[PDB]
Amino acid sequence: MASRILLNNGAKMPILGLGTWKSPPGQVTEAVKVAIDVGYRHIDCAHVYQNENEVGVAIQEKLREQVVKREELFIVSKLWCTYHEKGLVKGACQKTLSDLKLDYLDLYLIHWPTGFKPGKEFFPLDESGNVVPSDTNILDTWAAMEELVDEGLVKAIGISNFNHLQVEMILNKPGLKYKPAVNQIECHPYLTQEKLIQYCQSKGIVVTAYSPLGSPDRPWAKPEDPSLLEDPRIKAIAAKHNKTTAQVLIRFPMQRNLVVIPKSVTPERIAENFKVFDFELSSQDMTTLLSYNRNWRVCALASCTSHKDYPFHEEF
Numbered sequence: 357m358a359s360r361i362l363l364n365n366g367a368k369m370p371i372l373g374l375g376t377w378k379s380p381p382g383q384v385t386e387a388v389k390v391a392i393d394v395g396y397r398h399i400d401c402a403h404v405y406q407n408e409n410e411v412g413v414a415i416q417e418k419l420r421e422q423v424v425k426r427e428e429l430f431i432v433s434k435l436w437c438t439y440h441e442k443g444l445v446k447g448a449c450q451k452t453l454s455d456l457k458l459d460y461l462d463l464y465l466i467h468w469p470t471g472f473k474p475g476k477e478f479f480p481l482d483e484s485g486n487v488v489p490s491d492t493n494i495l496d497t498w499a500a501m502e503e504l505v506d507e508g509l510v511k512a513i514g515i516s517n518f519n520h521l522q523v524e525m526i527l528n529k530p531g532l533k534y535k536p537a538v539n540q541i542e543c544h545p546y547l548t549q550e551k552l553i554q555y556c557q558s559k560g561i562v563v564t565a566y567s568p569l570g571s572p573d574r575p576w577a578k579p580e581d582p583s584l585l586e587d588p589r590i591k592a593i594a595a596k597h598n599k600t601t602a603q604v605l606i607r608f609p610m611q612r613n614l615v616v617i618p619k620s621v622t623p624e625r626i627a628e629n630f631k632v633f634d635f636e637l638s639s640q641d642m643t644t645l646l647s648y649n650r651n652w653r654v655c656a657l658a659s660c661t662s663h664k665d666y667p668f669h670e671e672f
């Protein structure tokens with residue numbers, strides 16, 4: 357298992373990164389410092405997570421301490437839905453760069469294909485509770501992302517939560533200048549994503565798997581919900597390999613040629629989650645894990661199902 361995957365912009369991306377959604381601002385600086393200390397070189401960020409300033413404090417301190425060089429880090433962030441307008445993309449990127457203490461991002465993603473009305477609220481609502489859309493389409497937002505490459509603000513651009521028809525729309529864009537490098541999507545044994553992964557990989561787009569542990573801290577979790585970390589069948593595979601269930605859940609996407617971004621703010625777990633380069637799941641293990649698919653989504657963007665660009669009506 358090599359530690360990095362080659363992107364279609366010619367750069368290499370570490371296959372293991374640290375997630376930061378829901379990482380409290382008072383804990384994420386230490387989480388990122390610990391992660392870098394124990395070997396992580398890829399941090400997954402977003403403006404909507406409201407903690408990029410604190411992530412940036414950690415990155416800057418580890419650069420200042422010379423624990424790592426900037427060229428050895430792979431920092432990812434995402435353009436929020438209220439910034440899909442052509443005239444807002446650069447400023448949104450610049451705010452993220454300022455907060456992260458960086459002069460470029462390694463990868464900048466369109467967070468969702470759905471654009472929302474600009475303004476202070478991340479989910480602008482009408483009086484009846486529907487999200488208010490923007491009329492800016494996927495393709496004009498993509499052109500604005502391409503400009504960020506040409507201005508030196510980002511080394512690579514990509515997409516997140518795009519279904520295969522939406523990926524295809526980008527790939528078929530008239531005058532396309534840079535292909536998406538990555539599509540970041542939810543993926544784990546209960547949402548195995550075979551069809552969308554095969555499509556993206558066949559086009560040279562690298563897939564990053566989010567919520568690989570099933571996001572047990574997601575705010576809308578219900579007690580009755582499925583639990584990957586507590587699935588006895590997955591625990592059994594872990595026991596056979598003398599690893600933890602989380603380690604199996606992280607190694608699984610790695611062996612599908614995916615990048616994976618488990619989140620933790622717990623120092624012991626941050627270190628545990630990185631110790632996944634010392635064992636191999638068999639093909640039988642992999643097929644068995646794939647068999648657990650239930651089409652179960654942590655992140656359905658449930659308030660936006662009527663948006664014209666809502667991604668999850670299509671089969672994939």
Ligand SMILES: NC(=O)c1ccc[n+]([C@@H]2O[C@H](COP(=O)([O-])OP(=O)(O)OC[C@H]3O[C@@H](n4cnc5c(N)ncnc54)[C@H](OP(=O)(O)O)[C@@H]3O)[C@@H](O)[C@H]2O)c1
Pocket residue numbers: 374375376377378400401467516517540541565566567568569570571572573585600602603617618619620621622625626628629654655
């Ligand atoms: N592009 C998108 O739309 C999108 C959407 C969702 C997620 N993401 C990205 O993907 C990242 C990962 O997804 P996620 O945050 O939803 O969830 P996740 O990584 O599947 O699960 C995180 C949860 O698992 C716990 N955990 C971590 N390591 C563990 C271990 N070894 N043993 C037991 N529990 C463990 C964490 O607890 P502690 O933190 O308390 O240790 C936390 O509650 C996000 O943080 C974000 O960066 C992107």
